């Protein structure tokens, strides 16, 4: 199954996953292409934040679905 991860600043990342995979493994797959540690990344789907310990089937993620990667900022 094919999914897309669109981060802010327009960069698009292509991922291969299968249902039954676990959110933590899905996010660890991101590191192989970005170097971002799993504990440092938040990913959002359909207005909900994907919690750890769940699987894709629970959130009903299907083929060609889009997930966003977001970060907090420090300036003020």
């Amino acid at each position: 199954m094919q999914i897309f991860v669109k981060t802010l600043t327009g960069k698009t990342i292509t991922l291969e996953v299968e249902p039954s995979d676990t959110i933590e493994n899905v996010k660890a797959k991101i590191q192989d292409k970005e170097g971002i540690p799993p504990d440092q990344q938040r990913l959002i789907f359909a207005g909900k934040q994907l919690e750890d310990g769940r699987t894709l089937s629970d959130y009903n993620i299907q083929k060609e679905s889009t997930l966003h990667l977001v970060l907090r900022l420090r300036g003020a």
Partner: protein, 988 residues
Amino acid sequence: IDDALYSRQRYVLGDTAMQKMAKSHVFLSGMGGLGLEIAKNLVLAGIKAVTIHDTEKCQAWDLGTNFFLSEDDVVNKRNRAEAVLKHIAELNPYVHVTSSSVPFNETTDLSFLDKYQCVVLTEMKLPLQKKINDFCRSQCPPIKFISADVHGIWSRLFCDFGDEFEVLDTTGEEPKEIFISNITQANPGIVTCLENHPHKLETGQFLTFREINGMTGLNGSIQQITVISPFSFSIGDTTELEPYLHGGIAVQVKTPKTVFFESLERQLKHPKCLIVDFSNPEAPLEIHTAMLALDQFQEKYSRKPNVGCQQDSEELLKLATSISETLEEKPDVNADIVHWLSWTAQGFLSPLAAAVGGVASQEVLKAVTGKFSPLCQWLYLEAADIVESLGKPECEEFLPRGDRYDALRACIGDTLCQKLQNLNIFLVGCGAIGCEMLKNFALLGVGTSKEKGMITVTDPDLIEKSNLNRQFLFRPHHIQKPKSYTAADATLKINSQIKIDAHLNKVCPTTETIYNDEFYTKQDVIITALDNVEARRYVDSRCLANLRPLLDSGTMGTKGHTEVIVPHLTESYNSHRDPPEEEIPFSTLKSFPAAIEHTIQWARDKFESSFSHKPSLFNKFWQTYSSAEEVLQKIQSGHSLEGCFQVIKLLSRRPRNWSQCVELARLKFEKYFNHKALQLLHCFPLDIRLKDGSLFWQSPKRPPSPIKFDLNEPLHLSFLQNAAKLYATVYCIPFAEEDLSADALLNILSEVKIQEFKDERNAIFQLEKAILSNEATKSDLQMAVLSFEKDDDHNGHIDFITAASNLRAKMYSIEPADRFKTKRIAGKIIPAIATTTATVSGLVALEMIKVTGGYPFEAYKNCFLNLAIPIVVFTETTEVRKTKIRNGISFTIWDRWTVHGKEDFTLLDFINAVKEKYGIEPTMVVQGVKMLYVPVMPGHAKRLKLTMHKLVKPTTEKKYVDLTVSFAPDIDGDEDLPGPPVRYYFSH
């Protein structure tokens, strides 16, 4: 460009964009709240000329939406455009602002619009907008068109930049740099990146190459790539070229892009809206239909719908149904949206206006400069969640009463308005966001009730010249005054009933005494506008201990975020980690730089070490011991001393006048930029090889080369002048500005020789020589300590740093950097602009109402946005997490256990009490970072027979202390199960 005022903005826009911003005229129509916000943001941005236009007159209803009018203006019935002209021009004296009042109608001659370059329309009937849009887009060149409106809690934005628009920078992110490892003479060729470090590229992008050995034909060319693997990609045919030897650097190339727009009349039948909430992707079309139906109704009846009149709602619903089937996509009709739009058609919500104004100002900047990717083509923001949780309120609660809060009352109702006026709110920091939050509070009437209500704002900093660009509450004649007092005085003018208490403290663990737990208990909501993560974490920990809501926000450039924390519902700030700055590896920084940042960091560290640490050590050492003869005697007796060699060496090489300072600077130049290269080459020759045969001086390492001194080069002269001035300042040697001339330096250096390139007894001899020369007086054992000051243009710090960095870069043959980039990198200045701060402040003000109303968990939202794409993401806040330990016992981060003790309570009694009350027994008690009972370490076995009062050593003001505990795991060899913090009371 006077950098002292636009220092922050240049890092975002750029020199070319700022050049294009000047020589630009903008026409702005409709001086409502939204128009005023747009005008304020544009004037702060720095447009050359702005023309504001309006035809109505001030009314009492306008006081609740405009933060520049006054009672006198309403009494005198002045024109709205004229009454605000004077105050707006005060924001920036470099901007020429003019007012106009020519009537707009169907027969107005639109020929005069060709003078301007962008038109922003607000509070205009739809047919006039259609006509103006038709006229503007047909000019040669076309005139940009932007429309914006706010009705109650619903907003609409529209853009049109002509048939074809050109963008010079799609994303605004700086290109990255990659190192080539291998190339193949194949069709197509295959390029393999270095080990690790994925290229992070995508198909279709363009690259250029340089510094390649063997494949010299590829140097300076441009290729289009096709990603194959995370560590490799492909380029064009290379079979006809020489074999690849080694080396190579590829850097991404930016490419202009062309986008297409459509006229307003055509877009009304199938808009290309932008999705902001992916839970309801179909909402924007329904909102568009509802707004169009409202416009048709207003045209038909020449009035807006009255609140509570059901026939108006039925008519509006029928109009919406008629319109919807005519649309190309044929969507459904949302009854709830139409109902609420009818209910609050005559209201006005200030924070939504602020957010829309910020977005519109960013769009105007995009239109005039072409810097970023423009919006295409609609945007529909709304705050329905505020009223969705009210249920079915009565119509009487929304009727106007005849004061300045009529608009807000018509928006949200009387009860929520009254609950707003009794808030006690604590605001941390008074930066760019703080002023906007204060303005929004003043407009909302927060804390204006006589009986209850207060606003507390704390900030220790003072007003600076560069701060006036973003913070509009400050004025040029306010420099070097506390921020909090000025902000309070400015805010009191907007609303006379506001009660603000201002402080000058900095929220930190040292000042915890004044901000005790009773103070936090008194407050109702805490808002932060900080700029560092340590303060954010400390404030979050403090709020977590008293169950108080927290609202947090931050911006950097064109990106921003907001977060909401509510007790018993959501996780705290500390539940997520933040990315720290990556450290440069020590060898790369010290000996093998490969980019300009490494040289800049080296120069900064050299400045710190040479002018701060060493003088401090010298002063401390010579204040530890009274006399130099005493030190000499102690040395002669074999007594060891700490840092004696360094301080005695500094004493021996102490200059005495200006000429010796110049000579010292020359020697420092030689030592820094000549001998290091020779030593490094001597240790590692250019042809040395590793085990596998690869040359040692391969990428990313760059071989160095010595630099010969020459006074004609400006760089050498600048370095010499700055170093001489700094050394003279440190050693307290008087000097005059005439001595800094090139001729004087040439005369001084004409008799100075340069040594060629190749302990206790020496130190004793040098100290004795200093003793016999009467050089050890009290005045000689003193050196001034300097501090880094990046905002001063005459101390010479930045000049020295830039000169050193550029010299070291040329030593390693790297491209130099100018003064401003060096200043930004050295000072770690965060780029900022007014639009993003206004937007995030509006969103935070929106969320504050939901926090006040006590809405359920599903109402709160978090926003992550990047206006450069543009892209906005609304998500639900993180739900609380259950954590268990044993026996089915579970706890959340908001839990806290309590144990009541007495005067003779012992540690064993504490353990037994916890075990009996909660069912499990602790195995380690630690107070903060100071341990109290750990069985492993020696001597703690006997601590079980001690009084807790002695064992804690508390302060009499506090009646309780907080402790952390841990519990033994079920299976040995595993980490102890964490537990909730436990609060211990000394007595009943």
